[PDB]
Amino acid sequence: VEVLSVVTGEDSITQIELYLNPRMGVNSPDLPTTSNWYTYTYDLQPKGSSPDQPIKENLPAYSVARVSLPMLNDTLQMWEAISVKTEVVGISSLINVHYWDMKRVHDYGAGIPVSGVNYHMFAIGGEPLDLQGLVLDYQTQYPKTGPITIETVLGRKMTPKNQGLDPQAKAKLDKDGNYPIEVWCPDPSKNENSRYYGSIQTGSQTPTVLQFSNTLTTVLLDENGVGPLCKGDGLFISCADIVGFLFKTSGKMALHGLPRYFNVTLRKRWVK
Amino acid sequence: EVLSVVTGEDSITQIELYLNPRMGVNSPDLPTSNWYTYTYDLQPKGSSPDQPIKENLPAYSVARVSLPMLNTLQMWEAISVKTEVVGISSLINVHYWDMKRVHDYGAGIPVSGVNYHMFAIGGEPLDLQGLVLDYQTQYPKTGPITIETVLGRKMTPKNQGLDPQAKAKLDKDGNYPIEVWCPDPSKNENSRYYGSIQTGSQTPTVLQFSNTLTTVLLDENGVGPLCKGDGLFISCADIVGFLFKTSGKMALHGLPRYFNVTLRKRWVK
Amino acid sequence: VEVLSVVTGEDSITQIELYLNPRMGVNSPDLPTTSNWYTYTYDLQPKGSSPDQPIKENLPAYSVARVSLPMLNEDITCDTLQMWEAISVKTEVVGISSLINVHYWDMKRVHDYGAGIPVSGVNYHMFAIGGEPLDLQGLVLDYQTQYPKTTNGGPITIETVLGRKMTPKNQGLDPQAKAKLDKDGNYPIEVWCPDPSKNENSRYYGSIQTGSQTPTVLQFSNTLTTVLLDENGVGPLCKGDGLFISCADIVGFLFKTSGKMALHGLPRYFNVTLRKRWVK
Amino acid sequence: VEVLSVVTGEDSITQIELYLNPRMGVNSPDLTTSNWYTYTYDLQPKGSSPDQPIKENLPAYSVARVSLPMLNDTLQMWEAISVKTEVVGISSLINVHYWDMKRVHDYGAGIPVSGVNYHMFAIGGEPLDLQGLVLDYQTQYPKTGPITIETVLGRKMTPKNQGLDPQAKAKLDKDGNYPIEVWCPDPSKNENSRYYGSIQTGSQTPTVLQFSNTLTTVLLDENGVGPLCKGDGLFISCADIVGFLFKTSGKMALHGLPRYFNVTLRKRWVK
Amino acid sequence: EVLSVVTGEDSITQIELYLNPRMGVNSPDLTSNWYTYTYDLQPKGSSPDQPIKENLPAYSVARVSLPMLNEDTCDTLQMWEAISVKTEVVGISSLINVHYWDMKRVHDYGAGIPVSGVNYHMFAIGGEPLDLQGLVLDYQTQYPKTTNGGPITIETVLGRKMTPKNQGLDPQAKAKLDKDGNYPIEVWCPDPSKNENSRYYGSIQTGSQTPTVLQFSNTLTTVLLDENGVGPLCKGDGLFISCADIVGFLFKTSGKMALHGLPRYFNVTLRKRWVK
Ligand SMILES: [Cl-]
Ligand SMILES: [Cl-]
Ligand SMILES: [Cl-]
Ligand SMILES: [Cl-]
Ligand SMILES: [Cl-]
Structure with missing residues (x-):
């Protein structure tokens, strides 16, 4: 790629809106009987003997979407992503400490709120995100x-x-x-x-601490002022938002997700 | 479509109000009202389905403020706000009569745990998205x-x-x-909104207050919320944690929020 | 009130130094016998039954002083006068190091044979600088208190x-x-x-920290300065040539062997810089 | 070693990419005890003196000398100006269903990796200088x-x-x-050399870590000079302890992750 | 009255040093087995407290002799002026040790409880001794x-x-x-x-098992200039450097606890300044 000048004209700027629902293990809400735990895993437990043989419902996965942009066309125009507004949706739902099956903090008390292990990341790119494999235990x-x-x-x-x-x-x-x-x-x-931003938080009952605001913008330009360039007129958006454990009366534990919203601003760019 | 800021003598104004919290017990003058600014006891039943009572559902505060009438027209535009949570100092009370002790002969467990804080300033009602922990509620x-x-x-x-x-x-x-x-x-x-959550059951409540802090309400194009029909909408929620009772039972608590918005006149198409 | 220009001259800038000892409940060190708990409350606990009837010694209060400034005008009848204006302040909590003491003779231990539980838990910190008394809003946890x-003291x-x-x-x-x-x-x-x-x-700055054994985390440095000017470049203006200084610094609980608990507080130092300003 | 001007020209800038796998105690994946690769053995105070720790209970620093291209009294040296660095595999730490993991409570998930963290990296034109200091001299x-x-x-x-x-x-x-x-x-x-590090103590203290391809560290000092690679050799060093693996029996082992580097260098004249 | 910065060839100097902690056992030249630690810390159980010197961590301090400047008791003189410092706690990495033989196990068969709990960190740079205020938890102590050691x-x-x-x-x-x-x-x-x-910088962290959290880097610099651009002036050609670095408790098998400290390194930069 050889990056040239920013196109100037009438319709040089565009905007993209979308949301992505979490993929915690029970991925669909339309299935006959299983969909009651949609946006959760099943119960997560050490087996006690070797080897670990986990079920797909216990494996939170990344969300992805290829977004189709207006068609533009060895010298050509490409869409360049310049900035993004993003936000985790439904943070307020986590104030519920009265769910029927919540383990009580102590005798006759409120439920233990969704807390513990968090993992958050989002990415915007002009092609699919690149992944490296690495596991806790290779015998899994x-x-x-x-x-x-x-x-x-x-x-x-x-x-x-x-x-x-x-x-x-x-x-x-x-x-x-x-x-x-x-x-x-x-x-x-x-x-x-691509540009990605992520973090983790471990521990079992660690407070889930999250912000939301419609005034926050992430600039996507690199150190040369170039944003991700969209090949084949496609914008790839990726994320993951694990917000903690649901603690059940029996002592069992499941991980929970939340959906993420995106507003991406793009512009036309000459490349060769 | 936004035009130029009005240059004139009386083109700037100040709106000042407060909103008392709406935790479940919402009024201070009932036969009942002794738990004003609190919920009732929050307690997972143990068998399904959950059927929560209205006194265990903290709700948003909102108020519409009428603005001096102005009439391509002039509109009030919100440009900045000073906001503050009131009565933060009250949470040093560790001797409520029916307060669960930290240990025998010790003081009460202070108000702590779940915190939720947000406020919004807008030229129309705040838009809401629905999402629940459990759909069978x-x-x-x-x-x-x-x-x-x-x-x-x-x-x-x-x-x-x-x-x-x-x-x-x-x-x-x-x-x-x-x-x-x-x-x-x-x-x-x-609208412009700002919020955060903190979970846990005894997580310290950690809050700041100062009359020197201002939030600028302008967007990237230098434009604030535009009040259509001369109404400024102010919304908030401020859950500060649980009150721990001798019996083991727990209730959520809220505090009121103070507002001082600055507005200027603006030409619109 | 119309704020005019800053006075230009020789003795146009003055410094004001002071300190305020905390008012936690036992407020004097000169009293016969109970003055051994100066800078502390008594033992805080729930009564068990309605209603709460708390004592004086269990009620930490704000500290305050009015400081007399040098008089500026030789004629009060004038419509336009010089007034003192506070522009910046250095402030610090005194005796933070003393809280490393984990061997108070009647300290509850963390566990058997261990050191005492350090001063920790509830913290409340505020200070204010103003040209008049600080304005207050009442609000309580329980109205039946x-x-x-x-009248009874x-x-x-x-x-x-x-x-x-x-x-x-x-x-x-x-x-x-x-x-x-x-x-x-x-x-x-x-x-x-x-x-x-x-x-x-007035300008005020404050925070709270709840929880029962939450770490007390505090900083001190003589390089920190709080600018007291508002968004128009005007600090608090001293009406009646008096500067008001307020604060409160609760630093945690002292944990006694029996399981009883008292709040503790530390003193605060101030150095305020003031300039002369014309007013209409 | 007096520093002169930045070399101007076509090929004045170069980039070095690499990664380093952690050296926690069990250091090779190729030996047969290698299934504990990237972990220590069990760390367990004896209760009586002396402490005679095994080499599998002593996490060590990772290092590589990178060979840079030939450049040649006044000579050209490679100067390190910026670095992009990231801890790799952070997402693996969400696993709370390791087969022999101690449970948080009955019927519960395993205790996640957490507790003691130690993070550090260094870029230098020569080997990093070390100072010795220990908890107990009798060890x-x-x-x-x-x-x-x-x-x-x-x-x-x-x-x-x-x-x-x-x-x-x-x-x-x-x-x-x-x-x-x-x-x-x-x-x-x-x-x-330039170095950066931190530590966090405790037993179940949360592991809190960030990752992004947008963060750059500037390596220049206050005079605008980066490390200068003597004999054309660039020294990269790191350590990344991410906490404890809690096992069913009570036993605990430390775990580490790998670290990736992209370093930018320019040619500089020196006397 | 502070005048202009002296301009010349050798107008800038750098001063280097370290300070070892004074936790209670202050010499390594003996009982020195517990150097950089206190003894065991325990509430006495009865009034009044009578603590031994080994249970009282103290401030470290050193005066450093600077090159003689005035070759004459005049009105105007040259003085060394401290303008910046690089400082760092040494031996942070040593606290990953969770297998010390006498370290209390977190739970049955687990690793030791790391050094954690009470932290106190301060450092100062000055042209004279650091001024101190006394204040105690208990006046009856x-x-x-x-004069008895x-x-x-x-x-x-x-x-x-x-x-x-x-x-x-x-x-x-x-x-x-x-x-x-x-x-x-x-x-x-x-x-x-x-x-x-002087310029001082400090903090505290209480609680019994609070994580010890510390950073280290050779890129960090503290600027020592006040709001008028003047650093501490070394009168008598003496530079005063002070510190304290308590890093937490050593938790012993028996339940007994001692406080631990680490050393601090200083690189100070100074220039020559005309003063009245
Ligand atoms: Cl996270
Ligand atoms: Cl919050
Ligand atoms: Cl506080
Ligand atoms: Cl760390
Ligand atoms: Cl500290």
């Missing part, structure tokens, strides 16, 4: 494809090197609800045409 | 306005996520539960 | 300013429950906060 | 294996080694050989 | 006598017994940090009403 037996994991891309069993960084463990984030978060992270050695 | 009929009220029918599993139909406007004080409605980011172009 | 009557509370008993509305903001910080150790912190609807000629 | 470290204060002194530690001893100094020249708990960056040297 | 406390500088006012701000209880290991932290804080010729 993940389901076949279904979710895509390390042994799905290698075509063979994981070895101990997959507890660290293995250059062969790479994939592209092209499918909604299909790449487990505990297996995949953004690959820093690529993603030149 | 039996919210009181219309009393409080919830997703069932706006849809006409029962909630579906999809209301545990973002349902595009689950929309409403914050037009009534003490009538929209916080746990059902949050501000809608797909709209609200003529 | 029976505070000692001011007690502090000043909401009933005191209303002439009658509190009602359920005093758990919210009640326009009638207002007062002014003019006596040192007489306005209880749990009753009165600063009034944001007034206080245009 | 019997394994003999050379790991390089410790006794190794560099010849004789045994004394009580002064619980504070700063100017004789306890070393150079970070070997990957997985210098124990984090013995060696810290030496602030009295390191003029030709 | 009986600190050991100075012990530290300097309020009783020492008063020449009479502490009273209840010493639990607040008493203006008569003031002093100078002119001795290392002699002034206890729990007794003395920096006096904000003086120290016009």
